[PDB]
Design a binder for these strands. Structure first.
Ligand SMILES: *OP(=O)(O)OC[C@H]1O[C@@H](n2cnc3c(N)ncnc32)[C@H](O)[C@@H]1O
Lengths: 253, 640, 249, 248
DNA sequence: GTTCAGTCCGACGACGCATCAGCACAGAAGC
DNA sequence: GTCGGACTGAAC
DNA sequence: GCTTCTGTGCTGATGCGTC
């Protein structure tokens, strides 16, 4: 008997559209504290973590903890039929095979109701406690997006070299190679680059997933990356007064 | 009312037993009823009688409607040389049916699969989307005009325009026309009657009720007062006349108007063979070896030549200075070979103004001065005539002469035709040659020639009469020459034993049953089955039922982990791999669709069997003891 | 010789784009009443009516009633040439097998002749009848409704009650529905109700109809038992488009 | 060596945007006068020339007259990485197959190195001509008329007299025309020596128009039997011309 | 005169160029 | 391409 | 900024013509 009321439904739009291509399906945990998910990707190389904090809902009613199996492409089509300024309600019967989605216009005139069939999934989850990562960066989202959109043409992989003065990204390919440097910056908070870092890292990753990771960009004008030796890179977007989204990508070679 | 139309009545009458007004456009319902009667009958003569009955009424009542009725019966849209194609497959038409029924796709998909026929699903379900105007009756002229419209509307989003026209046809259906239209579109019309039989029906109709008579015609039965035998002798002599008259000009658009206007006896006086009008190629029977050759030719002189493993090419040179080429099937190959257009003046003698030649074109290794396999030939670009950047060099190989300077040569003994062929042409090694030819009647001489043929990349030997029954006419017999293929002339070819892991449900004769099977080789070094080929031929009907019942219980809901498949189409059911089948093949080819032997010859291009022929189940072996990837690689290396 | 001129040639552009995907060939009847089209769809499921009132034109002059067949493809490719600010002349010579147009920008003039075609006219005289529901709503919201419904299902059940209209459909995902209420002008929802009615329609056709949205910000839907649905767009003082959709079951 | 700076790097972005679809492979010829290129299209119907005056560069050092073979499609693929606001540095070695681009935005630096290639270049000497009709007209008007006429028929007839130019298209759909009459950057001007009519194929002009965002004005140069000249006036920097052979 | 003999008709197969579709994004235009 | 299958004539 | 669109391919998916 769950209910979520959210005023800013474009949040849910923007988070959901970041998975519809990555994974055709997912499972959603509901609990008194909020909504959570961890999923493996379809080629089983990278991991996605999702947290929507219950505090951010305009109204809440978690009468039980639930784990809905959901086809993300279908839900994506459905919310491609949802209005931006619309005020969103999710209702789930405990005993049903359905999630009710209901939407109310700001003009009070237009009432939408849709219901989506549920199903079971063979959930694989992996335990990932926090680590005191050797590098942390915050930097402008549109910048990193532009960098990935550039360098994926040059070559299939990037090498990232960080030092305390700044980071350099290298890509190499058939026409040649390219090195982009960024320095730390101050006195622009929102447009600045911040580095907290413990040792100069140099690591390699496949850009065919980085161009996927960038697809959240409208969620938060800043992004954080974190690096450590012989471990996945973490990429995180801070969901405005609502939650977070994280990608974990394992190192190449 | 054509729903009561019965051409299968005894004492059929041309206008009394008809179902529409004189001068009127013929109701398509009548043609569908006739196809219904044709499906009801297994007797070919009785079918040809019933079709001739309809044709006789058509030429009696509505003369211009004739040509559409023939092309409907031929499942064709015009002259084959005009290049017309309907260009609509199973998926597009299936969606058209689902939309016309208003159903979702998957139920009707499985339904059409289970009955193995789009016909019976085309009726039944209905959209209930009640039109404001009930449609006019269908006319056979309108329906054919829609089929050429369907063929004509190409371009972006063209599938919408197809779906709309086909819709109008479906919703306009009246009694049971849906089944025949759906089968008519999908190519598989399954009417059980073709070209030779329709021309027979034409000859029979146009004989009994000739054209040009004023309505009502006073004469109806040319056979009246003749004995049934001497009736048949008159029918059949007009048969050979018309069939040869068709084979010299394989096109109804040329034949029919002149036929309607002048009468079948004067017809040849207006129709003669000429370049710029194609002809049917020559055919041959299969034979197993020398005894049957010696017996079939026991009182006729003959020669032996190679079967080069290329494709046929029909060459037209006109005195006007253009040349045209047609394929084996009268498809218009000009555009494929603009280089060969340029080679013509260096191949002919200049003393010859025009010719028609039958020839094989084969890809050639210009530096190694040798042939390459047919999987190099099939790599040519199709439509555009850019001779500039030729990636595949080609050589021409002559074997027969059809027409020269103005004289047609088809009525002529082969000896004279080959004599004139050599005497009026020049060769150029690796560009144009005559086929290697050897004249004999004796056994080990042929054995030596065969051994040279197989080691010189040829499918076998060609055996042809020199003079007795050595004229070209397809009407007397189509298959006059013989092929001596390695396949059984070796006694046994490349036979293998492979593992069955899946089935395809069949259609038509194969409907309800399995129609084809999926085979794999045992890759021991992974211990896995890798897909190698499908099968669809060489087994009889009783043993078909034996395989089906044996397989039916062993179906699985999933593919097994010990099975490798990729690019090969998903089986209609998954089958437990317990059965091993013995099969022959013609050749081995590098496959982009078959995972077997991947990396044993090349890392990415797989391998597969050309022309697999079933033999027998090898039930004594276990699957893991069948042919393994090692022998597969050895066999292909031993091919080269 | 027939000649007509309009300053707002943008109307003509919008009109033909509202016609494009529905039909490819039509014969246009011109009278002293103005320009009028009937055309059934090539599937025989739905029909368009065009009205342009002659007094709506800035300039108009006619000798004779003309019925000219035109291929809608090529002529729309021609109408793509006009800027949104252009003044269109349509001219037809009575026995011509070509149609003459001029586009006039506010030192540059565009001139065109397009070939005509001869067409085997199918026309249905619609009887005037009352309909158990009439609804006056904004075009833009109807557009969202129809485009939305396109993904979820293929057929729509439209239900009306005095409390408000309801649109419902379903597919291989579940069910979608909208209940839309009245207001209390160009943004308004209003109804001319007679009885609570339910009918079925094919959404692919409504998605084809919706393309006329830029013509008028509000529209009439008119709905009755056992008869085609009427959608009508009144182009401002110029005329109207009507669309007739046959029902299901 | 070579060492250049340009502030308005968007110019070079638009330049390489213009060429990439027409000619795939080309030669960069370098001098104290700046950057120059001539090349002939893959159909060998049209010739392009780029002139960039060295004085227009924000900084410029040319030590020798280079000739560098470059894949234009790949060059454009690199140039897509800079924002139009970026200042650009070009750096060349003498023996190297490799050219350095340094991009700087108004705090970021892009370093990119492009390998060269060995090429057969076809040269045409172009002496002076004076063209009989010279049309100076606003660029977008030409571009839109080209995109229009592309549907009416694959060929055009162009006409000039001192009182106006007319462009006529012709095909099975129909025939059409645009008249233009002589009238700041909104004006059309003509100098006409002899009245002209010419026939052309549109596919190439469709390609030429992609240079339009380089210049507010385009100039047409017409004379008997010669290729049509279409010119995009880059502000103070130089010029860009296309020569197209008239039909048959 | 019937155990053969040849016709004829449709079952199915393996490749591959063409050839179009189906997201999906930069791009520009309109707001 | 290829093999089987139902049917009218073949000729010993 | 966002809109809906339009023109943009890029890469996939069968129809059809050979053996
Ligand atoms: O196997 P099949 O029945 O398709 O054979 C007929 C084809 O064989 C080709 N071919 C090759 N060489 C010859 C000669 N010398 N004579 C006749 N045909 C030959 C042809 O492509 C033919 O259609």
């Amino acid at each position: 008997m769950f209910e979520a009321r959210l005023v800013q439904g474009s949040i849910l739009k923007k988070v959901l559209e970041a998975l519809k291509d990555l994974i055709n399906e997912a499972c959603w945990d509901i609990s008194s504290s909020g909504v959570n998910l961890q999923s493996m990707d379809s080629s089983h190389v990278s991991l996605v973590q999702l947290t929507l904090r219950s505090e951010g809902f305009d109204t809440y009613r978690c009468d039980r903890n639930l784990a809905m199996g959901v086809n993300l492409t279908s839900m994506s089509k459905i919310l491609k039929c949802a209005g931006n300024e619309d005020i969103i309600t999710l209702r789930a019967e405990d005993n049903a095979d359905t999630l009710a989605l209901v939407f109310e216009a700001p003009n009070q005139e237009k009432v939408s109701d849709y219901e989506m069939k549920l199903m079971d999934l063979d959930v694989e989850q992996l335990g990932i406690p926090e680590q005191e990562y050797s590098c942390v960066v915050k930097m402008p989202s549109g910048e990193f997006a532009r960098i990935c959109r550039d360098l994926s043409h040059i070559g299939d992989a990037v090498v990232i070299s960080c030092a305390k003065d700044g980071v350099k990204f290298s890509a190499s390919g058939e026409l040649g190679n390219g090195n982009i440097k960024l320095s730390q910056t101050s006195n622009v908070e929102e447009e600045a680059v911040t580095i907290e870092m413990n040792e100069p890292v140099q690591l390699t990753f496949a850009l065919r997933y980085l161009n996927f990771f960038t697809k959240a960009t409208p969620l938060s004008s800043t992004v954080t990356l974190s690096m450590s030796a012989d471990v996945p890179l973490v990429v995180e977007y801070k969901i405005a007064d609502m939650g977070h989204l994280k990608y974990y990508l394992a190192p190449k070679i | 009312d054509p729903s009561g139309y019965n051409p299968a009545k005894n004492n059929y009458h041309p206008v009394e037993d008809a179902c529409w007004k004189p001068g009127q456009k013929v109701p398509y319902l009548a043609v569908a009823r006739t196809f219904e009667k044709i499906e009801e009958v297994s007797a070919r003569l009785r079918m040809v009688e019933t079709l001739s009955n309809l044709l006789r009424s058509v030429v009696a009542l509505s003369p211009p409607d004739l040509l559409p009725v023939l092309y409907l019966s031929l499942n064709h849209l015009g002259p084959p040389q005009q290049g017309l194609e309907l260009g609509v497959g199973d998926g597009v038409l299936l969606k058209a049916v689902a939309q016309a029924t208003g159903r979702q796709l998957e139920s009707v998909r499985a339904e059409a699969a289970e009955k193995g026929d789009v016909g019976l699903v085309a009726e039944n379900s209905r959209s209930t989307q009640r039109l404001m105007l009930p449609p006019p009756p269908l006319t056979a002229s309108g329906v054919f005009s829609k089929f050429r419209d369907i063929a004509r509307l190409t371009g972006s989003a063209s599938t919408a325009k197809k779906i709309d026209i086909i819709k109008g046809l479906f919703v306009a259906c009246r009694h049971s026309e849906a089944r025949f239209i759906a089968r008519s579109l999908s190519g598989r019309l399954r009417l059980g009657l073709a070209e030779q039989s329709v021309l027979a029906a034409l000859s029979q109709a146009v004989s009994l009720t000739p054209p040009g008579q004023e309505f009502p015609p006073a004469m109806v039965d040319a056979g009246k007062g003749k004995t049934a035998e001497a009736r048949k002798t008159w029918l059949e002599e007009q048969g050979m006349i018309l069939k040869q008259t068709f084979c010299e000009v394989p096109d109804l658009d040329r034949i029919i108007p002149v036929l309607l206007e002048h009468g079948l006896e004067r017809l040849p006086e207006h129709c003669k063979l000429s370049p710029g009008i194609p002809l049917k190629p020559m055919l041959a029977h299969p034979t197993r070896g020398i005894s049957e050759v010696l017996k079939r030719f026991e009182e006729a002189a003959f020669t032996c030549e190679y079967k080069y493993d290329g494709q046929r090419a029909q060459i037209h040179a006109l005195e006007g200075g253009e040349v045209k080429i047609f394929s084996r099937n009268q498809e218009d190959n000009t555009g494929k070979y603009p280089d060969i257009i340029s080679r013509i003046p260096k191949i002919k003698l200049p003393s010859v103004t025009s010719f028609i030649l039958d020839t094989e074109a084969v890809a050639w290794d210009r530096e190694k001065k040798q042939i390459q396999p047919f999987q190099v030939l099939t790599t040519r670009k199709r439509k555009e005539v850019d001779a500039s950047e030729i990636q595949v060099q080609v050589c021409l190989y002559a074997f027969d002469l059809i027409y020269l300077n103005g004289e047609s040569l088809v009525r002529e003994p082969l000896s004279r035709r080959r004599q004139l062929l050599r005497e009026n042409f020049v060769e150029t090694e690796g560009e144009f040659v005559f086929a290697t030819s050897l004249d004999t009647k004796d056994i080990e001489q042929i054995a030596e020639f065969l051994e040279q043929s197989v080691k010189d990349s040829c499918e076998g030997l060609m055996v042809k009469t020199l003079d007795v029954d050595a004229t070209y006419e397809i009407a007397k017999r189509s298959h006059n020459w013989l092929k001596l293929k390695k396949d059984y002339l070796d006694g046994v070819g490349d036979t293998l034993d492979l593992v069955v892991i899946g089935a395809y449900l069949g259609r038509g004769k194969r409907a309800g049953r399995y129609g084809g099977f999926l085979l794999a080789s045992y890759d021991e070094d992974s211990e896995e089955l890798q897909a190698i080929c499908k099968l669809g031929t060489g087994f009889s009907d009783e043993e078909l039922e034996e395989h089906h019942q044996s397989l039916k219980a062993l179906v699985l809901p999933s593919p097994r982990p010990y099975v490798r498949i990729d690019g090969a189409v998903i089986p209609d059911h998954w089958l437990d791999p317990s059965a091993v089948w013995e099969v022959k093949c013609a050749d081995l080819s590098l496959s982009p669709i078959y995972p077997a032997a991947r990396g044993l010859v090349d890392s990415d291009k797989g391998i597969s069997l050309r022309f697999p022929r079933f033999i027998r189940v090898r039930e004594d072996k276990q699957p893991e003891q069948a042919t393994t990837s090692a022998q597969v690689a050895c066999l292909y290396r031993k091919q080269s």
